[PDB]
Amino acid sequence: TERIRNVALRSKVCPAETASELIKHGDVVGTSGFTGAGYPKEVPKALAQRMEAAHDRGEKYQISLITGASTGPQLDGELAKANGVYFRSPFNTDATMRNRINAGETEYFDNHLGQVAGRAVQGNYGKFNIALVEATAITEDGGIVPTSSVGNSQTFLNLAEKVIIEVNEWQNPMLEGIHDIWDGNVSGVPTRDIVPIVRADQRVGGPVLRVNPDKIAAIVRTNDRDENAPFAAPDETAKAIAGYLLDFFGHEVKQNRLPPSLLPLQSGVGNVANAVLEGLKEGPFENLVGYSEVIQDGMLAMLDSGRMRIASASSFSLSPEAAEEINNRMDFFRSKIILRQQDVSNSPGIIRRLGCIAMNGMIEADIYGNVNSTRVMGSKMMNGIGGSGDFARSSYLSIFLSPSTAKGGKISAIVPMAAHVDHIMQDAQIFVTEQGLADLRGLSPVQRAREIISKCAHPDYRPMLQDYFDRALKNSFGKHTPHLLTEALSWHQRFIDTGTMLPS
Amino acid sequence: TERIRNVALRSKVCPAETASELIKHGDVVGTSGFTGAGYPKEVPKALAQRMEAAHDRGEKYQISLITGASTGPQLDGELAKANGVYFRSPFNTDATMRNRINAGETEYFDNHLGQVAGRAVQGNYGKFNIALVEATAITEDGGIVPTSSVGNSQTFLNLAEKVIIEVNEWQNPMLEGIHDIWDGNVSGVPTRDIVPIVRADQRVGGPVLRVNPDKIAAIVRTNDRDENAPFAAPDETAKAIAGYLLDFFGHEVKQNRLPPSLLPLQSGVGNVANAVLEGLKEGPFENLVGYSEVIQDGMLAMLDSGRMRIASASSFSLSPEAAEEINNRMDFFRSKIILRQQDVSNSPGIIRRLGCIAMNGMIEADIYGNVNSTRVMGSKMMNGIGGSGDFARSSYLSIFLSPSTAKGGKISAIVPMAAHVDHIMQDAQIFVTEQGLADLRGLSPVQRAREIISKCAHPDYRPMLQDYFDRALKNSFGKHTPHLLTEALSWHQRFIDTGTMLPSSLEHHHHHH
């Protein structure tokens, strides 16, 4: 079954290596790719190999790389290995790229995912030379069917001088129809349009990305896999966290602060999110709705069981087993899933209107409930802020979930002062660890500290945290948000100096 | 001219003292009041007197006080003097109340202004016992005409068990019609309504607050002034800041990154904002539009000259001279001004849609462009975050303006690490001091630092900042956002210990070499 159904465009098919030659040193390149799904694969590999060769001849060859969010080894991996990226935005999970970033070899800035399109159009990344987008197919009228994510692809196609499409036969043809691409002005020049989404299952657009065929400079036929998520299941720490959260939801419903069907749910990926979703799958809440960034294993299961009615996202993030399941039942799941542009799934106006419940991980929080999502010891990038800000601030309820310790107990997730801040107190109402849940609604900082210390902190660290808080209350410059500046960051420095936050 | 045009409601008129008796110890009280405008005046004074008397006899008497934003001496002032507030939210500028807060005598939480209504309805502040709202008049059908601000008044009226109205003859009768109160679901139970505002001058509602007359337990006739801060005449530091900003706007327009009429403008109050507005009044930009929290002196002038076509806000913040001017020409200015509920003027959806330009003050920023708007030394509350977050994150362009030093030079506004963070790097693109302007668009933290240090920092502190940055780059745990945790907060501690952030040459400092 021919994937390029526009006959004329078949004339633009060429090899990856040749396509890669359209990318020049210094170019700004916008690509598809979100949570290891739907990123271009063959052209980046060919670009990387030509970059190394150029460097060896003492030729500079680097690009600025702007994506939906995280990609995979073929893209971030290969280009970082080749030292071919001088600037990267807005979200990465590749280890090699992480090292380039943390060594200062690649400039990085993690913009709010929902804002990337708008900033790109505003011109913050500079002029876009290339859009490199993966596709399931190209329709008879030249529409570009995206693959396992939408991301920023439509904006990149609009902005780029030249377009390269990778048509990937690995991606299931039945993806066609699952996406909803709006031609409204979401991220363009003000005044923007109202995005008329009033329900999570609402489609406002069509199944294809639009691009002027004159801009398409190359089509590359590919066959290569996405970066698929780990199968590993929720440990006891994660189940405890989930248990506290579900009890909390139970209580909110009994007090009429939440409908029996909760509100549209936003969740991340990983051990804890999986536990939460597994918990929701068997919980007392019916007719759930997902309005999130990503569809993960848990989601599919609930859509399957009917516990969740619809799931909105910009991307998939599945394990091999979950991928297998959806590919065998695509016709079923396709009626239940909507993949949107990331500037829509992460639109604060929409998130607030729908009243989403935001559930996010964190590196650490301080005793006053400031959250670090990104920078270990305040200086070493992990992944990026991603959509956590988009959702946390706009949500009906902002929830942060984490094991109370990290690194086998050598790090406390609750600290006197967060070494870097991603989400301010105002953007965090609920904290959950395997120790318990802190409800901070309506509380002053001193009152937040009492809750977080007693409910969330690990017994190994709680006395230390209480001691810091008590002495701060007695000695701080002001008493509104008590701190001891001489030791506020000392647990972090202690970890740097000794490999643990536990005193000797 | 009778201000209470509903005849039946006249039966609820009583004295301020008597009205104050409806407020019980432990009550949660929602009031009008935003940037020193439209807050209740007589009842709070009477409540304060009765509170002091109670305290002297060993009786507890405190309230939780929830407002639009800042109030005035009659409210925050009097109640704080009486030690009558156990919790306060979301924004205060009164010095006595600031001391109660900074002493731990009043619990305080500064929620995003645009979020207060929604959180109140959600029940975060608890159940509202009293709404105490100032009014210009009461219409024939019992509508409450607000005064010099709208704030959260409509939400407080909806939520409160009992309502007290202060009808203030000091407030100009012609304010009637200037407000736009929407009956849509902005801050209620999800799913919320779409707020159909697609232009800054658009009205979506009506001129009155709505309340069930059965809830009105008392009406008090008053006659007392708002808190009109004196005009802060722009000093040379402020004019320099304005000059760099206007040049920047000039350049954006020439590069087609902004229309010749800029975009809807959000600005704060004070020396610098006044300079910016004064600069705009004489600048090359025509047909300007205001979409802000407050109308200040500068605004009026531009609406007068025609440079500014319309100004949207939730509140007034005028000097006496400016108040005088608008009261003599209310008919004119009323056609040019729209006062909205703060959950609408500060709605992120609307701010982003309109593409506002946000211009805000700050306590400090660190070399990576994180901004502290609230907590000196990280622990002593100044005013509050206010709407700065609402606007900074949602804006087309987020701009922060500040003198590069504070306290007669004893403090640098650019520091290695901010002692508290209100606005993360992602929410700040442009910084302006009297030293110059930093454009951070598209830059990594290390790149932002290079710009902030060289463009914005004061010459007295720049070498110290560069030295911290250089050594951090060599030694930091990671190199993406280089820090030296051992000294990141040391300038602040130095200020605490010595009253200045400038080193003593009696000690070694790396920048001295």
Ligand SMILES: CC(C)(COP(=O)(O)OP(=O)(O)OC[C@H]1O[C@@H](n2cnc3c(N)ncnc32)[C@H](O)[C@@H]1OP(=O)(O)O)[C@@H](O)C(=O)NCCC(=O)NCCS
């Ligand atoms: C913060 C975040 C990294 C936590 O991840 P998580 O899977 O929920 O929880 P984990 O405990 O498994 O964290 C995994 C890693 O973080 C590290 N980590 C977590 N807390 C840490 C801490 N306080 N100090 C140092 N490292 C820490 C762990 O060591 C682990 O690293 P490793 O794989 O090299 O061993 C993650 O949620 C994230 O990147 N968020 C950013 C964007 C986002 O929230 N968007 C929303 C939708 S996805």
Ligand SMILES: CC(C)(COP(=O)(O)OP(=O)(O)OC[C@H]1O[C@@H](n2cnc3c(N)ncnc32)[C@H](O)[C@@H]1OP(=O)(O)O)[C@@H](O)C(=O)NCCC(=O)NCCS
């Ligand atoms: C941060 C803020 C206080 C700056 O004030 P400003 O009017 O622009 O300029 P100023 O230099 O006069 O600041 C006022 C006070 O802050 C203090 N200050 C400013 N920077 C400081 C610093 N780096 N360290 C210590 N104190 C500082 C000044 O000493 C001054 O002291 P005082 O009130 O006791 O006399 C003010 O903008 C604020 O409260 N922002 C939050 C609300 C907001 O931005 N809403 C949006 C639109 S109004």
Ligand SMILES: [Cl-]
């Ligand atoms: Cl919208």
Ligand SMILES: [Cl-]
């Ligand atoms: Cl709250």
Ligand SMILES: [Cl-]
């Ligand atoms: Cl809206």
Ligand SMILES: [Cl-]
């Ligand atoms: Cl940017």
